Design a protein around this nucleic acid. Sequence first.
DNA 1: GAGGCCGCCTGC
DNA 2: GCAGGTGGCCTC
Length: 815
Amino acid sequence: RISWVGEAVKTDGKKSYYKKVCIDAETLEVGDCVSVIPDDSSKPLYLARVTALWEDSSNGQMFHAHWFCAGTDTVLGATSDPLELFLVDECEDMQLSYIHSKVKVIYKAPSENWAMEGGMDKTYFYQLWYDQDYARFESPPKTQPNKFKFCVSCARLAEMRQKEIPRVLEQLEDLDSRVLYYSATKNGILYRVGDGVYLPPEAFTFNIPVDEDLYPEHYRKYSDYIKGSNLDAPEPYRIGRIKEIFCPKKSNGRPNETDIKIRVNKFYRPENTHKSTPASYHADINLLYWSDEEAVVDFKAVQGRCTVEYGEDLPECVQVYSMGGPNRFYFLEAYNAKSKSFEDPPNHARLPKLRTLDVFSGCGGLSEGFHQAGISDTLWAIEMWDPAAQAFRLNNPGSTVFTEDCNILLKLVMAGETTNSRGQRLPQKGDVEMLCGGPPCQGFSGMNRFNSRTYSKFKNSLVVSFLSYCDYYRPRFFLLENVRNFVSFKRSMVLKLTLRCLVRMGYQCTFGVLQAGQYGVAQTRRRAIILAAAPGEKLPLFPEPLHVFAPRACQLSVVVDDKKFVSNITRLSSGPFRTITVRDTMSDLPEVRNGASALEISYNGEPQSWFQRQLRGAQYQPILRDHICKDMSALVAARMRHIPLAPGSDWRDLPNIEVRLSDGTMARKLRYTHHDRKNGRSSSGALRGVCSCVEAGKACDPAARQFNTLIPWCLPHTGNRHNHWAGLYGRLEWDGFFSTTVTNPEPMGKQGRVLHPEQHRVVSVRECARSQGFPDTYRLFGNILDKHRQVGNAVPPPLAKAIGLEIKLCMLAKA
DNA sequence: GAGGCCGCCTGC
DNA sequence: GCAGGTGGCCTC
Ligand SMILES: Nc1ncnc2c1ncn2[C@@H]1O[C@H](CSCC[C@H](N)C(=O)O)[C@@H](O)[C@H]1O
Ligand SMILES: [Zn+2]
Ligand SMILES: [Zn+2]
């Protein structure tokens, strides 16, 4: 049968504990690993570590099973090592009758000389702990012993439970109906009387028909959807100052400490006063107004903690305070809602950087963000394209910039070479502490029709070149950025093989999708991010959103092999700061014409928004650089001049007129040869089809093509299968956001919403840089198309900065 | 170079 | 059907 080895060690109620057991041949101990056959006989064997052995008074002999995770059930899937398992926080008590056999598993700890093992290329083994929800591989926790029957998974799942439960800490006074407290804790955050709190926007309230003859293609706007619009963006958090923490005293009288309430003073954002949304235009994004309005909410509703300080009692200035920490707000005046006026507030309101190598550096958007975060000095940068190399050099005088193929340069280092052919010193093992880069996006971009032409192999891709840098140099931290489609390209195989390489090297790693607009730009730009960290390090979290942003642009979850993954991000429906708009981004720039080429002009005025104050910098700038526009042809310029200024205007609003051009001498009038039965006809009975495509799908006749037309011919030609080419020749809206900033803004590109909100022209280089969050002092290089490409390829610095601050926490938390 | 032209997949 | 895709090729 199954008899016990020895006697009992613990006496706990209906369970008699033991230390070791014997099942028919085999002595079994705690710490031993076993196998368990599943109920589904088709499924493979289950594996676990034994952490407890006991006997119940009603049921048979029991044991506690800390489950292992097979690699094939992680995000790796079929690319996993068959013998690799991963620790997880899953466990359960089971009958000893379920144990099939004892199995040996080894722990493959990284070597003490792991950072030098790079470049040199029948038993279960594990090296990493896995999180099934966030696709995180991490070093095994160090939760020591809960002395004998110490399950690792139980210890931290309970520690996670206490961390998440709202608890009061220090009583302050026992009143008639409530018990006042001085402090409370929640999700690891300590709240005390006087602190600031984030609250959901619903926590409390405050005390305050077209003439189809001339515009024929107007019918194609039946969708009534406006790309770039900010009508459905959520409100930012409510902010309040804790006045009381308290619990209902029961009918007996002791406090019910499971039902914690807080009373707060309401803070007004500028846009919450009688001066509505326009009040936000010029104000700092973290300016508040004190108010004497109070509100009671449940402690559970608190979304986080913030600092709200009286402005004039701060020892440093307001800019040094605002730039020196997260979640920092300030106030100067108070708001009297009934008086609708502003009064003075009452009296009762008063690490050394990492040496970084930037591969595919571009002009340096990613490196600039990491520098702003204060974590890195990019001492080496590799960039094959000379104009972008030169841009990087102008902004980073202490950096060694290699205008080199990254493949060639790594081959040189691996062969023992100390310098490149220019005489520049090559980084060696030990020099590189951080490795970051965005490989070209163009092979993964969904707009690329012809990705099926040249690049087919993964072994020969720049992504693998980049991982070879990681393997060779073995940096403390690693970052790879790309377009969102990187996670889904080739049924997610590229994502899975990248993560597979990292764990094979011994790296902790993870991946996620981030929306740049949630970190401080007026732009929808969803980017995939792989983070990795060396074994002795802490793996960074993805940064919590700072700005609210339109929900349709914030779909960040990723399906891989019928398993949905999300990142650690918990701010899903609100955030501390309002959204950044096209107005915030470029309302201060002077008017220029189509084809403006003056490289250095006057600003003609001071910065207007917080965002412009931040990007123009503290030091006075007498000259505005690179506010230059592509010189569009007479036809295209004539098209832009008749795109209405109203929000949502694009090619579909173009009049059907002939127009004399500046230097094209005439633009022809497109007319509807054949009929579209799907779309019908307009008030006049006009055909509504422009080619032989729209009848029965037969073929295009070249006679139906109409050259040099004002309404471009190719857009009605294929609009029915392209959603009416929405956005092409489209204007931005002052209250909206940019669509994705691309390398060459052109009104008939797929991302065609490139027209200025008021001027008859494509957005300038400076405006594109502003949409990416570049400081106005950030140097670009080359002709105007070179400059557009450097900006369009770049990681927005505010996004890179947010990621970098997460890396900073890991630098501080290690030692 | 400048511009016109414009597939296919994902996710809903 | 709708909405989104740091775009590329081909012809002048
Ligand atoms: N084989 C190669 N070696 C080095 N750089 C390369 C390369 N192939 C392409 N590149 C460069 O890689 C870059 C990808 S775009 C990267 C932009 C950068 N992350 C920023 O924030 O500015 C392009 O600038 C391209 O010129
Ligand atoms: Zn357990
Ligand atoms: Zn046709």
